[PDB]
Design a protein around this ligand. Sequence first.
Ligand SMILES: Nc1nc(N2CC3(CCC3)[C@@](F)(C(=O)O)C2)c2c(n1)[nH]c1cc(F)ccc12
Length: 167
Amino acid sequence: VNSFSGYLKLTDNVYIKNADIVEEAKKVKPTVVVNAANVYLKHGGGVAGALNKATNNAMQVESDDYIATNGPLKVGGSCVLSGHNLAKHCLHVVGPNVNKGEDIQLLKSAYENFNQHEVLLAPLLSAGIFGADPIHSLRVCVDTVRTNVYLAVFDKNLYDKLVSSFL
Ligand SMILES: Nc1nc(N2CC3(CCC3)[C@@](F)(C(=O)O)C2)c2c(n1)[nH]c1cc(F)ccc12
């Protein structure tokens, strides 16, 4: 039993809700919240900008130190950093950005990072400003992640489309 409330169950291990991931994280304090990061951990907009803003920019400060030490992530890769006031940990995962021409096949590799964590609160990778089809992203998530994933979808309209078209 865990503290996630109001989710619709899609499969044995994947759950979905219409929610703001910032507010969902603030209330649940999950062990892991996933950020839709870029390789530079520049959290300017989308989910990343919203998560970072909710941390009063502490996420960005920590991220800049991480990059200065380690260099950029790989597309499809991840790193574990602090969850600040939102979660114990933040798993920064880089899905391919279609608006940069990145290979969508890397979306599966991105979701594989979730399997290193028993339970996660996460957005749909490569959705939103990353330009991928959220329905495809959900399919890859379901077919790749084996651990327990609670997906937060900000837009009510897209949420309904994702549920209604789910196979
Ligand atoms: N550009 C942008 N995309 C965001 N996504 C990307 C998205 C996937 C489909 C498009 C999303 F809309 C959704 O799940 O419906 C969330 C958020 C955001 N800005 N600010 C936010 C603040 C939050 F608390 C949570 C999510 C976002």
